[PDB]
Amino acid sequence: GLIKSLAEKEKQLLERLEAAKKEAEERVKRAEAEAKALLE
Amino acid sequence: SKLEAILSQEVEAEIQALLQEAEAKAEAVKREAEEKAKALLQARERALEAQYRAALRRAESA
Amino acid sequence: MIAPMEKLVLAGPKGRAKELLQSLQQAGVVHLETLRPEALSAYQLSPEERAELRRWEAVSAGAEHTLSLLGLEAEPARPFPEGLEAAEKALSPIQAHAEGLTRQKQELEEELALAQAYLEPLERLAALAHGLDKSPFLRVIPFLLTEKELPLVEEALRKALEDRYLLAHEAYAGGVAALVVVHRKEVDQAKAALSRAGVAELRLPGALGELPLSEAARRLKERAEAAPRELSEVRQHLAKLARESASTLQSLWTRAQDEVARLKALEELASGRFGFALLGYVPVKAKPKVEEALARHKESVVYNPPWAKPFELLVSFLNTPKYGTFDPTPVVPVFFPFWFGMIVGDIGYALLFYLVGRWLSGYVKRNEPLVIDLFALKLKPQVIGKLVHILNWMVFWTVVWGVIYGEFFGTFLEHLGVFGTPEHPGLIPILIHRIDTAKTANLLILLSVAFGVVLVFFGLALRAYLGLKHRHMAHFWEGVGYLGGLVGVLALAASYLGNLQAGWLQGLMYLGFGVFLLAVLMSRIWLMIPEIFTQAGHILSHIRIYAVGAAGGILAGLLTDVGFALAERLGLLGVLLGLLVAGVLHLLILLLTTLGHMLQPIRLLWVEFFTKFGFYEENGRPYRPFKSVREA
Question: Where does the record locate the signal sequence feature (chain B)?
């Protein structure tokens, strides 16, 4: 039994998706600052 | 083991899709601005000159 | 349709769970369990996957079903791929042809059946009727009545109608096709009158009947006539479809089927990982390597001879572990001497068993359902027949061996080997028996008696290994302790066992031997000690079964002796051919009954099998009965 797998690997994976999303939506928030800025 | 490997195999390509979507979402924000800023400022250049010359003209009419 | 790989299904015991698990895991095989409690909860198949499976079922079934109506089949093999779409498509046109034609054929038969039957009454009524349902001025009511009915029907009609009706009849056979004719307005009374009698207006039911009697009659000639011919065509097409397409039907069918199971296998493992068996999905790359070896414990779906053949099958039951003592496997070599030796016959017994053996191992078409024996053709279950083709050869060897046990046995009659009695006689060898007479007979009596005892000794040895090595202490204590009694048994036995040859090499030896017996039964306490009585009962039984196997055995040889040789009066010569009146007869009867004798070997064995002398069954208890284990 390698047990660990079913409760943990499946978490690791989730948190790899998670982190991607974070920096990502930020690149857009970065572009928002600029979006305001150019009109300003 | 290999079982959970398939669970791995699923996640990595998704990480990249979050990014591709994202990339487009920053760029577009950037590009929405690019045209908009340029297009108003033109109009405000325009407008300011006319709102000048026609006065000076009307002044010439004095 | 899952991610690429061919699904593999195995189930087996706990030991094979492990061996199997290792064999799938290392290569780059995927989604393996038992290897964690449910990370296949993270391999839960999609609804889409369930659907694909669902489609496969429609196709799979459709092939079977269609094959059925068509009247031909297909049988399960080893899985193979085609693509679902191809198979469905393949299944469809044929299913449509066969189905349409099958109905048509059925209809045709019916058309013929009714039309011929109806042909005569409609004709009789028509001949009488000279057209009257044509008319509304007169109305006619046909009805059939037997002449049993005729005075009564006539009275009811008479009572209502008077003479204001015409009752005419011309016979149909066993009765007369009859008409009551009435005027318009009289119709209501006319039907009611027949009904009261119990007869009623008769014509064919439904649309055809309504037609004039004359018209209906014409049609009946035509339908009856038309239908067999027409039937031939519909039947022909069907036959033809079955003939050509059968392989095809099967190939789609097999293909589909392999998917239906395969898909299911995936779903269950997905879902909740089962237990001691083993799942996985195995790639195309991986797939052979894992399968070739199998260690003999599981069940899969992918994607000299006398001693070996049944013995080979016991090997599979050796391999399973689920307990702490040796697995049950001795039985086939315990069986064999007696199996051959049941037949220990004489002239008509052992030495005639041959005719059967070459028939069965070979092919015999002599028989009303048996043709080629390789093909298991039977009025009894066919399926059951195919498997024991292997057996036909091992039985043929038995038939050969029993014949041999005719000349060793026949030592103590005629022949040479331990006795000197004529190597061969002149008239009928085994005219009468040395063994019928007491001294020879007696030796045979004592001979069976020992053999039951021997099977008991083997069992208690196993018993002590069982409770010892399974750590079933109550049982351990029992297997060693029970042996304590025995010396005293031998003591008592001797004064009757040789009578004069022994009895006094031991004596009141019993008094201390009986104490030795009970010592540790009592050490476990055991609030139910008397119960050892029944362990003693088996011994007498073992003896009895062998004894009977012998005595009924002996009896068999002796029927050839009172059936061909000597009996009548004090025993005379011409009895040879007086008995031949009987002689041909005794042979077949004898054959039937000796089959009864061989179930006694097994009856003996059954004593031993569930008596916990290295066994898992104990009136059930997880493991398949022994019943299933020994048969081939």
Answer: none
Write out the E strands in C67-191.
138-145, 166-171, 176-183
Question: How far away is chain B from the Cα of A30, in angstroms, using its nearest Cα?
Answer: 7
Between CA C569 and CA C575, with CA C570 as vertex, the angle to 5 degrees is: 55
Q: Domain spanning B1-62: which CATH class is it, in words? A: mainly alpha
Among A20, A27, A38, the residue with its CB nearest the CB of B33 is A38
**φ, ψ for residue C594, nearest 5 deg:** -90, -10
Closest CA to C97 of C105, C109, C87: C105
Sheet holding C176-183, edge to edge: C138-145, C176-183, C166-171
Q: Is there a contact between A35 and B7 if contact means CB atoms under 8 Å apart?
A: no
Tokens of C72: 């031909």
Structure tokens at C88: 């469905």
Long-range contact pairs involving A14-22 (C-beta distance under 8 Å, separation at least 24):
A14/B11, A16/B11, A16/B12, A16/B15, A17/B11, A17/B14, A17/B15, A17/B18, A20/B15, A20/B16, A20/B18, A20/B19, A21/B18
Domain positions in chain B are 1-62
Among A4, A6, A8, A12, pick the best mutation site for testing chain C contact (most C Cβ within 10 A): A6
Distance CA C295, CA C16 (A): 8
Q: For this experimental structure, what is the resolution in angstroms?
A: 7.5
Closest CA to C554 of C405, C454, C404, C334: C405
Partners of A12 on chain C (C-beta within 8 Å) are none
Solving technique for this entry? Answer: cryo-EM
CA C214 and chain centroid, separation: 57
Report d(CA C280, CA C2) in Å as an integer: 13
Cβ within 8 Å, pair A6-C35: no
Which residues on adjacent β-strands are paired with residue C281?
Answer: C7, C30
Using CA atoms, how far apart are residues A25 and A14, in angstroms rounded to an integer? Answer: 17
The verdict on a CB contact (< 8 Å) between A6 and C36 is yes
Contact C565, C433 (CB under 8 A): no
Secondary structure element (H or E) that encloses residue C317, with its range: helix C305-318
Which residue in A6, A24, A35 is closest to B32 by CB distance? A35
